[PDB]
Amino acid sequence: TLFEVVKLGKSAMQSVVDDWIESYKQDRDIALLDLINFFIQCSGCRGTVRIEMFRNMQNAEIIRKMTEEFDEDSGDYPLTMPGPQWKKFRSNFCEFIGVLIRQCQYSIIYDEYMMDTVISLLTGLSDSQVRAFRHTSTLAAMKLMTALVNVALNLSIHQDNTQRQYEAERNKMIGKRANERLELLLQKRKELQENQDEIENMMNSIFKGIFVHRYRDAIAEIRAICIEEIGVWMKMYSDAFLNDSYLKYVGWTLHDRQGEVRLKCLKALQSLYTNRELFPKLELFTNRFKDRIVSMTLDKEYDVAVEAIRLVTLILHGSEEALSNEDCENVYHLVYSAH
């Protein structure tokens, strides 16, 4: 009944998060079946995957079966149907998923089973020609990735804690239990490092299984979602992702055709650069794309131009070197815009 619970005014998310975590400890298979049904039903489908079908049928046949029982009226689906109920549904959806993953980070993530199942299912839903599944899977997988970004931040922080205790014991060189605590801290640090390696591996799996197909989607909104969430992650875990290796994807998406996508990318770029008083890398990226940004200050959409001008304001704040005379003359002429 999960879909109705998320839609019809749940009184608290954490309570059902805790109850589900306990029930998953009680039975992995039933709760996982409920999760599959959850992912299907967030797209509005009322079909049901059966227990034998769950354990035995391949994912492509399962998804095809759920196309049979899709029971749609039009080509509209809940992420495109209007009214406040579906937007509130999306908000509750992301809130529940993120709180659920964030409180389970010590057990469920390390079971070698859940992530493979979820990734395989979402990759098949995101590769399906049925647009509704592909859309819900895109937003869901972005939320999942953000939760994993929190996992990565928590893991790194814990590694720093065990490193600090290790260093304090590296100071404490005398003591029978000193060698014991040093070994246990090294063991924990190694286990967390290997766990971290698995986390980044899973991150890379998600990134190459989803993003590379979804940065180029036929639906402009999907591409915009992807750029939104990459901006979120780099704002969230800056120390590990803010390099050209990830910047290049943003560089490619700067050439989007649609204004809506440009507005989302522009807002993400504006938010990220303001985060640090002293610039964290990206200087090469700024050099590469600065001129095209200042040419994009004359977008047909006024909001895009606003975001562009604020970006140029950031370019001023960081450097004052990057701007040329002609840039200043052009913007000073833009002070007399009708808008």
């Binding site: 004359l298 002429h333 815009s337």
Partner: protein, 74 residues
């Protein structure tokens, strides 16, 4: 039967993006300046069919003269 719009493929050709790389004019335009002189601004104030059609051709600086005029217009 099955009134949902089916989508054949989601792939898009790279050449159109390469075209935007070679030619990005399709999202730019020319800067539309506001009127740079007083004359066109005062004309734009009392301009438009309603404003031109609702005030005399010879301006009346005192509203006392405005009430006799605006009174008689059905």
């Amino acid at each position: 039967k099955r009134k949902l719009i089916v989508d054949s493929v989601k792939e898009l050709d790279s050449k159109t993006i390469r075209a935007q790389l070679s030619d990005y004019s399709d999202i730019v335009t020319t800067l539309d300046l506001a009127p740079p002189t007083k004359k066109l601004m005062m004309w734009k104030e009392t301009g438009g069919v309603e404003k031109l059609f609702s005030l005399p051709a010879q301006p009346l600086w005192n509203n006392r003269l405005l009430k006799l005029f605006t009174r008689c217009l059905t």
